[PDB]
Amino acid sequence: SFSGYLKLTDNVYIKNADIVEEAKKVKPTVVVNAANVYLKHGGGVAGALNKATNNAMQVESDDYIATNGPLKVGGSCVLSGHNLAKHCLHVVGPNVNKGEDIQLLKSAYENFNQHEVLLAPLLSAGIFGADPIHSLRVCVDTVRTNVYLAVFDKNLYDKLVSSF
Ligand SMILES: Cn1ncc2c(C(=O)N[C@@H](CC(=O)O)c3ccc(Br)cc3)ccnc21
């Protein structure tokens, strides 16, 4: 049910799209969230996904942290996808604006390999401060399962395709 994507490799696809609108249309098995270790979904992709769930994602996430403590940078957890997907895979890429090790970006993408197909954003891009061209290259070189990347910004999408 994914449509309109540009094929980059055997398993990686990309589209200029709002991941919330894409998730509402497709209702994928897995949507990836660009999470932080606390699962505090304030801004960026996480703020947008949480708002689309009417804050249900944040209420579930606060219970998960109260029980388990914070995630690791490069780690993940599977929670409900609420009205957006069957599941949400919350993945923590390194935040350059907080000074985190960019080498953890490959470990972050390795979480995607536990799922046959995913709808996802580029990790560590946007307000996380990493170069999105670098993030797409690590994604291509690490993920082996089928990943459908939604890039919100039209100008960034064009730059990512042209420089691939
Ligand atoms: C309504 N809302 N607010 C943010 C956001 C995001 C979001 O932060 N995406 C990131 C990642 C991406 O989409 O490639 C991003 C956005 C813009 C630039 Br420029 C660079 C990275 C995605 C969906 N809905 C969103």
DSSP 18-65: -HHHHHHHH--SEEEEE--TT----SHHHHHHHHHTTTHHHHHHHHHH
* Resolution in Å, one decimal place: 1.2
Q: Look at residue 18 and tell me if it is in a domain.
A: yes
Alpha carbons 48 and 1: distance in angstroms, whole number: 22
Q: Look at residue 1 and tell me if it is in a domain.
A: no
Alpha carbons 102 and 135: distance in angstroms, whole number: 10
Q: Look at residue 63 and tell me if it is in a domain.
A: yes
Q: How far is CA 74 from CA 48, 77, 124, 138, in A?
A: 21, 11, 10, 13
**Which one of 45, 95, 136, 160 would you pick to mutate in the ligand 1 pocket, going by the greatest count of ligand atoms within 8 A of its CB?**
45
Report whether residue 93 contacts ligand 1, using a CB cutoff of 6 Å: no
**Count of domains in the chain?**
1
Alpha carbons 43 and 127: distance in angstroms, whole number: 8
End-to-end Cα distance, the chain: 25
Distance from Cα 152 to the centre of ligand 1, integer Å: 5
**Max CA pair span of the chain:** 45
Q: Whose CA is nearest to atom 20 of ligand 1?
A: 126
Q: Look at residue 32 and tell me if it is in a domain.
A: yes
Alpha carbons 88 and 115: distance in angstroms, whole number: 11
Host domain of residue 23: 6-161
Instruction: Indicate the DSSP class of residue 153.
Output: -
Backbone angles phi, psi at 113, to 5 degrees: -70, -10
Structure token digits, residue 60:
């579930």
CATH assignment at residue 72: 3.40.220.10
Report whether residue 152 contacts ligand 1, using a CB cutoff of 6 Å: yes
For strand 87-91 and strand 76-80, is the pairing parallel, antiparallel, or unpaired? antiparallel
The answer to whether 120 and 147 have CB atoms below 8 angstroms apart is: yes
Q: Look at residue 126 and tell me if it is in a domain.
A: yes
Report how this structure was experimentally obtained: X-ray
Reported residue count of the chain is: 164
154 sits in the region (left: phi over 0; alpha: psi -120 to 50; else beta) called alpha
Distance from Cα 1 to the centre of ligand 1, integer Å: 22
Distance from Cα 153 to the centre of ligand 1, integer Å: 7
Q: Look at residue 75 and tell me if it is in a domain.
A: yes
